[PDB]
């Protein structure tokens, strides 16, 4: 299986990066 906390970590990090890039652009 996969750790649900690591998936959550990825989701949070990906969203933060995406929202920040779109904010700047």
């Amino acid at each position: 299986s996969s750790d649900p906390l690591v998936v959550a970590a990825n989701i949070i990090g990906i969203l933060h990066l995406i929202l920040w890039i779109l904010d700047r652009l």
Copy 2:
């Protein structure tokens, strides 16, 4: 039995995301 390291990572990432959103708003 969750990994505290991974829990810490989620707390940091989520706090950072929330603090950044609220600052931009």
Copy 3:
């Protein structure tokens, strides 16, 4: 082996940190 999801977490985090530093400077 290493968890691919933890590898993705590092890649995302360090990319975000690098892009933000570069943006600011």
Copy 4:
């Protein structure tokens, strides 16, 4: 033992959060 890839994830996120706060403050 602790997973070093998870330690690094915490170090990156913590550094990034701190740098961003200090930059805003």
